[PDB]
Design a protein around this ligand. Structure first.
Ligand SMILES: [Mg+2]
Ligand SMILES: [Mg+2]
Ligand SMILES: [Mg+2]
Ligand SMILES: [Mg+2]
Ligand SMILES: [Mg+2]
Ligand SMILES: [Mg+2]
Ligand SMILES: [Mg+2]
Lengths: 321, 322, 322, 332
DNA sequence: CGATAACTCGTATAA
DNA sequence: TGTATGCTATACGAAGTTATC
DNA sequence: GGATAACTTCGTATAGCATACATTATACGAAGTTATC
DNA sequence: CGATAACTCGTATAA
DNA sequence: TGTATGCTATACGAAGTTATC
DNA sequence: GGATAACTTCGTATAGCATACATTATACGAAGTTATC
């Protein structure tokens, strides 16, 4: 009755979230309704007893703990934004989730992260791709240069556009990073390419002709002939950028298994992780690293370098003296 | 209600349990919320969720900073919760519109600013430039800048330092005792220590000013056109003046600031804080160590205060270039 | 009641959301309680304050330790609150008698016992004394004592290690991965690294027993009279066995466990932890580094893991005599 | 015991409860009771004088009382103690507690601020560091007076073991053993906690052992292993052992006071605390001495049974060893 | 075979 | 096993005691 | 009888810790259980 | 007696 | 000014698309 | 004409990360104030 109004307002300001959240909200509501109408359950308002059976179902489907959490999570957001009791506030639900988390991690489940794209990998890739002339092997080598030199997220590298680019009297470029994705942007408001990586990006800037219009997105599509098609309305999808990583990896280690494992070949974050791991080996303080990446937590970074010989622990040092 | 008017009378009676700055803003936001509330014919208390949303949006329209708007929504909340009534933010209507506004304005290209850094670089310069002066005004300001930079203490905190709060370590280094800060209010205090270099800068300001006359005198005070420091133990230099010492010292090495009307065009009160914060990060100081220096309890803030190097920058750039 | 029967039911339902030992101990206590309850003609649920008190007083009577008594009171409380009823400890009479019984036992003489240390010194010995042996189990045990001291992991944790949870650093050090410990259950888990010397003791037992023929094999498995391994992926080595290894290795050097009935008369499950905790203390390791090594997140547990140097002790004595 | 829970004011089960509390009275430290009773007396008297019902306490009155204590110029830690004891009374008797109401909570917060802004700061014991022990020694080691020998052995042990005066008064002959090294080792049974974070035995250096051994063979406390290590010494300089009466901790504090009087003279005329050594003086000084000799925080804390770093840090805060990161950067 | 090396329970107590 | 904060020590001036000058 | 060193007892004022809460592990002697010898 | 150096207050925004 | 947990964004196989080959 | 190269577009499965909550402080131009030159 009243909830209906809440829902209308919930929608009136749908702008209060990312299209990416709404994707999952809907994506899960779907899965919920689906499961309900097949078991005879009112998908809304959801009854704790039902949700439980549901969550317990996703576990049987093989989904990871993090996913079951997103499902339960979106289910909540839906109910909270309607003056309604969220299923997590029910003693049955929170009780099974604790059951599941333990059951799964205990069963051996485990969280993974991107495959590192370290320095050694930038040099190898710079070698075979360096002397190429193709209007693509150029673009790609410059995207990789930026990925590892600014640890920027792919979605950020996409939005970059010539205007943003400028230069330092040192003879190195400086990508202005306007339009952040946070009020208090933990990373800089300016990322600066090295010397080499500057040259490499320039090469692409000429051969592409994106230079013309400044509102043009630095990176763009490149058809089967070898001609870039600059634009200022559409940006090179994140999916494409991921591919650029995927491809380069394949060009050196063949194809992925028949297996279904994730992170078998480089991906969007592969730069960041590698970047992190290198600064570590170098001796950069955690505060310097955390910022160079725009990280706020400190565990996430320790996660990427948890297997270096430098972070082995005090007991080891003690035993070898 | 009976309890409502009782919860409020309780708060007003002991209004001194809150910062005077909290009162100043509670009142400012109120009159502002009342004004609009009248010239729109709406009840200003208890606030109706749908009316607050309108007001918040009216503020977005006015072109006010995300934060400034949260501050408004913030007092409104405190007023209701301290009353015992549910708060505006307890309604999806206000709850969501607030996010929408934070979301919109950020994309429209808006981000929070921070004081223009005052780093070691700048200190060494401003020092060797006034280092030799024999004017009371100069001698003072050089110490103010030394403490400001060395301790990372906020201007408010500095304004309160009294000669009796100063002691020394066995090696000669000075020690200032601080009781109340922005986030701490205990009788244990905290002891911020000076370097041998800065400790001397204060000593010179102490004698030339004659403030050790009464252990209760504040460390910093006024100095009139005649060049004579006027110590006091009941009137402290205003934080407006310390901000002045900063602006002026910057207008001295860079002269006249822009006509932009923008904020942070010249050194302000927080400048040494953010400046030092940088210098340390840049020097490899650990997270914990950078925290005791600034009085921060979690990496969260410390990290915020960093926007770091640019020119040739450092870190990655400094890594690629073999 | 009606709901209580439910809440208790749901509780039993996902009874897997809790620790195995938690349930084991719940029942055991309810048996001890019910028992005394019947023999004294008192209801057993809801447990009425006075009864719970006469009972706790009964346990103090029966000569039980403080820690043991709290466990009973604690289980009794879990049952009550988990089922929706007020806790017997919520009653001025029960919350007090508990404090009293502790106060009295401590004030008398009673103290908490700790595991008998197994420091680096003890490791070296046990090593140069088994290091050469070619026995299939003499090789396993030394690889266990290695990991225990080196990682400070708890026996139940060491018992769940699978070959697939092992990896290596470029420097060539093993780097076991733990997923569930007493203090945390997550897919993130933590990675404990072994030294070069100790990584070696493991690289051996791995071959000599070929547990490495199925990634899902538990690194440690039983050995039979004949000295032949016995890999598995459905059966972990009992923690009771691990406790055994310690005693055994203690016997091997200090003869037989004197007949005194008391506990901690010879190395046990936790000896590696306390031992390592101590050795790190002496070596001068920092708090954040020791907490990291033992999976502790607070200063007040690490300190808790110490009651240091005996005889000529250290610190103060070293200071004065120096 | 208590003031006088009224014939008609204390009504119902608040009588049941209060009765249960005195039944398990042994649930709290004797000192805790001391303070509960003192506060109640203090509040009770304030109530009479100001015509207020003392129990249950009305919030508005508790508040007038707190503003009263502040006006009497007491420290915030003390005012907190008074509200605390009051809360315990009320809670442990079934009634809702003051400080559970806006009036008291707000006033309390206000008092705290106003007082810190007035410059009120927490004081700690005057340190008794090594250089102090060495001076006291160089003087008192030549005295044959039974009292002086006792005192020097006292000081020696306080500084060496970092034990609290309540613990030193409990050491009894049979708690002393010998180390193959040839130095004493004091076992500390009857600790303070279930889990004794300070250890189970303290070792005295060789020199302090010599100091203690001289007190033993001149006091004759060996006569009965059950005798307390320390005891009285009268007008005539003759020890008086006992296995039933230990020296009051007041007396121990008296040794520190006196020893300070001997070297530095009569105490200043103000009324400030900590103007001469007290019972915690060795603990503090020792923490400092160790800090200067480069000891790990963990090792220090254990040497003194500390469990919360904040405290030892409070003791070594002014050592140049702890000036900070900004001082290092500024001093190239 | 029967004797043995080598390994599920229940209560008590520490993390 | 973490740990804020409610319980638990010490401070110390002054009054009460007991064996000695 | 007093006066007095050297305490003990008191009561209020402050400093300094240590535990309750809700589980989760370990300790260890005794039976129970397999595959060797 | 000006003219001048050197210092409350209200809205806006960072911590 | 701090932080558990609730938004946000990457991962990727697969299906549409649209200019070359 | 039909077969790609190189991408968009999806929807689901996971990783990463950053913010509401409730104050408390700084920014800074204008107007006001007081010894001094
Ligand atoms: Mg808000
Ligand atoms: Mg007392
Ligand atoms: Mg000294
Ligand atoms: Mg003396
Ligand atoms: Mg002195
Ligand atoms: Mg130190
Ligand atoms: Mg006297």
């Amino acid at each position: 009755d009243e909830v209906r109004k809440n829902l209308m307002d919930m929608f009136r300001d749908r702008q209060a979230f990312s299209e990416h959240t709404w994707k999952m909200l809907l994506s899960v509501c779907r899965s919920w309704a689906a499961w309900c109408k097949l078991n005879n359950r009112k998908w809304f308002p959801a009854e704790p007893e039902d949700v439980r059976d549901y969550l317990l179902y996703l576990q049987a489907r093989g989904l990871a703990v993090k996913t079951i959490q997103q499902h339960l999570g979106q289910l909540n957001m839906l109910h909270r934004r309607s003056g309604l009791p969220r299923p997590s506030d029910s003693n049955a639900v929170s009780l099974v989730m604790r059951r599941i988390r333990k059951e799964n991690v205990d069963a051996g489940e485990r969280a993974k992260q991107a495959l590192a794209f370290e320095r050694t990998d930038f040099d190898q890739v710079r070698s075979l791709m360096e002397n190429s002339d193709r209007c693509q092997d150029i673009r790609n080598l410059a995207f990789l240069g930026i990925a590892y030199n600014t640890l920027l997220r792919i979605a950020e590298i996409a939005r970059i556009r010539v205007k943003d680019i400028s230069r330092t009297d040192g003879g190195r470029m400086l990508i202005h990073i306007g339009r952040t994705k946070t009020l208090v942007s933990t990373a800089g408001v300016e990322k600066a390419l090295s010397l080499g990586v500057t040259k490499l990006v320039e090469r692409w800037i000429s051969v592409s002709g994106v230079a013309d219009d400044p509102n043009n997105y630095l990176f763009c599509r490149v058809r089967k002939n070898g001609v870039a098609a600059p634009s200022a309305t559409s940006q090179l999808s994140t999916r494409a950028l991921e591919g650029i990583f995927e491809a380069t990896h394949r060009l050196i280690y063949g194809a992925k298994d028949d297996s279904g494992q994730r992170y078998l070949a480089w991906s969007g974050h592969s730069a960041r992780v590698g970047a992190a791991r290198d600064m570590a080996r170098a001796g950069v303080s955690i505060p310097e690293i955390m910022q160079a990446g725009g990280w706020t937590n400190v565990n996430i970074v320790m996660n990427y370098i948890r297997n270096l010989d430098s972070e082995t622990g005090a007991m080891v040092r003690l035993l070898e003296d």
